[PDB]
Paper text:
To determine the assembly state(s) of the nascent ribosomes associated with Fkbp39 in vivo, we determined the cryo-EM structures of the particles pulled down with Fkbp39. We identified 4 major states of nascent 60S, and each state could be further classified into multiple substates. The nascent 60S associated with Fkbp39 represents early ribosome biogenesis stages. The structure of state 1 shows an early assembly intermediate with 23 ribosomal proteins and 19 biogenesis factors. This state incorporates the RNA domains I, II, and partially VI, indicating that Fkbp39 is recruited toward the end of transcription, consistent with its chromatin localization at the 25S rDNA region—notably, ITS2 is not cleaved. States 1 and 2 both resemble S. cerevisiae state C,33 except that ITS2 is cleaved in state 2, state 3 resembles state E, and state 4 is similar to state E with ITS2 processed. We did not observe clear density for Fkbp39 in the cryo-EM maps, suggesting that it binds nonspecifically to nascent 60S and, therefore, is conformationally disordered.
Numbering used by the authors:
A (entry chain t): 64 to 249
B (entry chain o): 105 to 238
C (entry chain G): 52 to 237
D (entry chain K): 5 to 29, 52 to 266
E (entry chain m): 199 to 271, 293 to 296
Write the structure that this text describes.
RNA sequence: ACAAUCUUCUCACAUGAGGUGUUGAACGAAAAUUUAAAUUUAGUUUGAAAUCGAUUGGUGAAAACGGUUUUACCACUUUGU
């Protein structure tokens, strides 16, 4: 916690500039771990970033203000860029919106048209087209959608034996590796 | 009973000790002594428990026990040498006041005409004393 | 009960009910749990190279020589823990060892019964740790009997001067009268 | 001339050296400024250039070069500064081998002077510690980032030829001037050049912020070299 | 059942015990390895040992086994 | 997990400006400051050493009912975007 306190003030004081990997309207950020008895500013930022629990999956629009948040929890989260066809399968596999507050899967487009009818979204493909080419309804669709959960899969016999290991996740801007991490996510 | 465990790893708080000593029983008082003008701990922490028998049991657990590169010596001494100020200010967050920042607020301080007249009031008296020092 | 189990509990108790001489009495009082978890943490850097991956570095050493290159001119003197009973008796007589570790379960107990007496005479700080197999895991063996650090690099000298001070203060500084009286007869 | 509209040097300097001779049986320049010029305790020195070298060349220095250490170690021998720069210690080795507090206290006293590359000057505050970073032994930001003997020997000469100024949060600035064996003319010239550098990148308000400069020895009284007669008007300007 | 008579090992001996000098083979490269290297190095010239890069790349054409030889020479309402 | 993010330069320009970061304790100098108090503050010492000696100004963040207790580097850019 003293290391995180030093990491916060060092990155805040005289470090008010961000890297912000460009050429992407959206980014993929996942909290690969957590901090036991974390700072009050860290947990509130985790509540702000909607990654209240580790191994949660949600894509966020890339912005200068988002980059400030992307540099706030980078010690505890890993960022990157989302692939085109990977997100097409991610929504098809782990599309679980907060239907009436309950994280129910979007197994049919009728309920997708019922809730997102005001956003002119009736199908997942139309929702993905409003997500990849992020339109005005991208923020509202993510607001109605509960975040996905990318729990790392323990496949081999070593994955069940290692001491508190999760198939070796990394920290920072994975970029294409974030899509590779998504490729192994589901 | 009371104990004064020394050679603790630097940065260890009473919040850390009271979280650990409460697993041994009741932790009545605890004092992590620090530098008066700095506030950083002096690495000489004293803690008072409810029972001397429980405190004597804990001391048999932490007599020269290595913890993060230091053999932590913990021996519950008698209460005959215990004074009233042993637990002075216990269970209270210390105020490491930045007096330098206050002095920086003092050195660089807006003032009135008379407040500025008080600063240069003794400027000539100090110069006259130095004139007689030659 | 099977034919052998009723022996397997009785030789457990006849070591208790009889009069253990002070030479053997110290072989059951043993280094504790805590301070026997840092000794093996310091040793787990200085393991001998596994015989499979010593060859692996030898084929990588012998391939450049077959072209003209070399590394013997720049090879610094290696490090590891020193093991084997006959190699560690000569490392104590020559006053080269600095931390001798004695297993508490050597089956013919005469193999190590002179070591706590030899370490007391030659001034080599010593401790009796559990489970000969636990030493065996350190050096890639089935059952080790003893180990010894004779030279750690400059990295861990400051760590070693501290961890020995835990070994004398808990084993040698204590256990000072139970080694000087008979045991057993419980 | 530029400090307090007067050049009262080389006359009191001749008197102070005589006073040092008078009080026979180092000199620090205590200064009274307008306010706390130091915004914070800066754990770094200011390379004040002086014609008279107060750094004794008889002392030996150790340069904490960045890894790989085998490159600058040969360059230290290539520069022929073995008698000046004693031991080239790598940035990895200093952060790995010598880590105990007494060992650091021993490693501090094992050498005599210090040299540090500006490329790695910032990491010194944690690996070294207050055992070195508080016992009046601050690192010298040597500029050897190029990697040439011309860049090394010149920086080595600049290290031994120029004084260091450790700045921190304070309204009182002290300046170590030099030894008593220096000439009074050479000491006043070095003090005047120090004042030129002080008004450039040390004093926030320049010589106007410098109110009273009082020179003293290691144990002598602070004789005021120059006093700002218009400081009463400047005090009312700042404190308003 | 008396106490432990440590009449001899009470004190500490300060010297080493064996006095024969330190051999020269503890201050140089291990000449048993230098012989061992030359057995491997010779083996490369005769081509019986695949080398370290060959230790890597001959594992990579394998583990592709998906039917590389021919084995054969109610409805909706 | 006793693992962990303290700065092996940056930015401008080619000269600059920056690079915030250091056990404890004991020891002890003579000067300057700052606002009687504080600040800077020689030289020391020593095992990451220890057996009462705590100083007490200011900023607000959550529970609680405008008080109240909880932070164990919250410091003047002052405790939960």
């Amino acid at each position: 916690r003293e290391r995180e306190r030093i990491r916060l003030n060092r990155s805040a004081k005289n470090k008010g500039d961000i890297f912000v990997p460009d050429e992407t309207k959206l980014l993929f950020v996942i909290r690969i771990a957590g901090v036991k008895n974390m700072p009050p500013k860290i947990r509130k930022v985790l509540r702000l970033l909607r990654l209240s629990r580790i191994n949660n999956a949600v894509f966020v629009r890339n912005n200068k203000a988002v980059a400030q948040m992307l540099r706030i929890v980078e010690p505890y989260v890993m960022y990157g860029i989302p692939n085109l066809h990977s997100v097409r399968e991610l929504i098809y596999k782990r599309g679980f919106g907060k239907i009436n507050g309950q994280r129910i899967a979007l197994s049919d487009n009728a309920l997708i048209e019922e809730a997102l009818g005001k956003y002119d979204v009736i199908s997942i493909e139309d929702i993905i087209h409003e997500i990849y080419n992020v339109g005005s309804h991208f923020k509202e669709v993510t607001k109605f959608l509960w975040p996905f959960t990318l729990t790392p899969v323990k496949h081999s016999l070593m994955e069940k034996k290692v001491k508190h290991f999760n198939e070796g996740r990394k920290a920072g801007y994975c970029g294409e590796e974030i899509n590779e991490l998504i490729k192994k996510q589901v | 009973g009371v104990l004064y465990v020394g050679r603790l790893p630097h940065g260890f708080y009473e919040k850390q000790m009271r979280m650990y000593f409460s697993q041994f029983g009741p932790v009545l008082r605890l004092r992590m002594s620090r530098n008066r003008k700095t506030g950083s701990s002096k690495h000489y922490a004293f803690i008072e428990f409810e029972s001397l028998d429980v405190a004597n049991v804990v001391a048999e657990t932490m007599h020269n026990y290595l913890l993060y590169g230091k053999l932590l010596q913990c021996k519950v001494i008698p209460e005959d040498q215990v004074h009233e100020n042993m637990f002075k200010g216990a269970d209270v967050p210390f105020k490491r006041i930045p007096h330098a920042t206050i002095a920086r607020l003092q050195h660089e301080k807006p003032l009135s005409k008379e407040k500025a007249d008080k600063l240069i009031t003794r400027h000539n008296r100090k110069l006259k004393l130095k004139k007689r020092k030659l | 009960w099977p034919e052998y189990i009723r022996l397997q509990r009785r030789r457990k108790i006849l070591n208790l009910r009889l009069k253990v001489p002070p030479a053997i009495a110290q072989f059951q009082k043993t280094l504790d749990k805590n301070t026997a978890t840092q000794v093996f943490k310091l040793l787990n850097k200085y393991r001998p190279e596994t015989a499979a991956e010593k060859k692996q570095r030898l084929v990588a050493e012998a391939e450049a020589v077959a072209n003209g290159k070399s590394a013997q001119d720049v090879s610094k003197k290696p490090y590891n823990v020193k093991y084997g009973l006959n190699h560690v008796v000569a490392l104590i007589e020559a006053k080269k060892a600095k931390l001798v570790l004695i297993a508490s379960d050597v089956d013919p107990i005469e193999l190590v019964v002179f070591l706590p007496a030899l370490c007391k005479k030659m001034g080599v700080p010593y401790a009796i740790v559990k489970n000969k197999a636990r030493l065996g895991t350190v050096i890639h063996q089935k059952t080790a009997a003893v180990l010894a650090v004779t030279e750690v690099r400059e990295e861990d000298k400051n760590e070693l001067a501290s961890i020995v001070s835990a070994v004398d203060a808990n084993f040698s500084a204590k256990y000072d009268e139970s080694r000087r009286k008979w045991g057993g007869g419980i | 001339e530029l400090l307090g509209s007067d050049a009262p040097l080389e006359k009191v300097c001749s008197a102070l050296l005589e006073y040092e001779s008078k009080r026979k049986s180092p000199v620090w320049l205590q200064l009274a400024t307008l306010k706390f010029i130091g915004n914070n305790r800066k754990l770094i020195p200011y390379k004040i250039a002086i014609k008279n070298p107060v750094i004794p060349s008889s002392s030996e220095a150790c340069l904490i070069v960045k890894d790989p250490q085998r490159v600058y170690k040969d360059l230290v021998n290539e520069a022929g500064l073995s008698k000046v720069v004693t031991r080239v210690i790598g940035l990895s080795k200093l952060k790995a081998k010598w880590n105990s507090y007494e060992q650091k206290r021993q490693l501090r006293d094992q050498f005599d002077i210090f040299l540090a590359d500006d490329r790695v000057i910032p990491m010194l505050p944690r690996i070294l510690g207050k055992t070195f970073y508080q016992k009046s032994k601050v690192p010298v930001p040597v500029k050897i980032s190029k990697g040439t003997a011309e860049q090394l020997k010149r920086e080595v000469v600049s290290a031994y030829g120029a004084t260091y100024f450790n700045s921190a949060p304070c309204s009182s600035f002290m300046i170590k001037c030099g030894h008593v064996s220096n000439t009074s003319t050479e000491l006043a010239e070095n003090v005047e050049s120090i004042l030129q550098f002080v008004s450039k990148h040390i004093v926030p308000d320049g010589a106007k912020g410098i109110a009273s400069i009082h020179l003293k020895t290691s144990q002598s009284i602070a004789i005021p070299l120059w006093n700002n007669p218009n400081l009463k008007e400047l005090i009312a300007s700042s404190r308003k | 059942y008396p106490d432990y008579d440590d009449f001899f090992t009470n004190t500490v001996r300060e010297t080493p015990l064996s006095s024969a000098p330190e051999p020269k083979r503890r201050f140089a490269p291990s000449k048993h390895e230098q012989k061992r290297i030359l057995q491997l190095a010779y083996a490369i010239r005769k081509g019986r040992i695949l080398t370290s890069e060959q230790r890597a790349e001959r594992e990579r054409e394998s583990q592709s086994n998906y039917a590389d030889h021919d084995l054969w020479a109610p409805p909706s309402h």
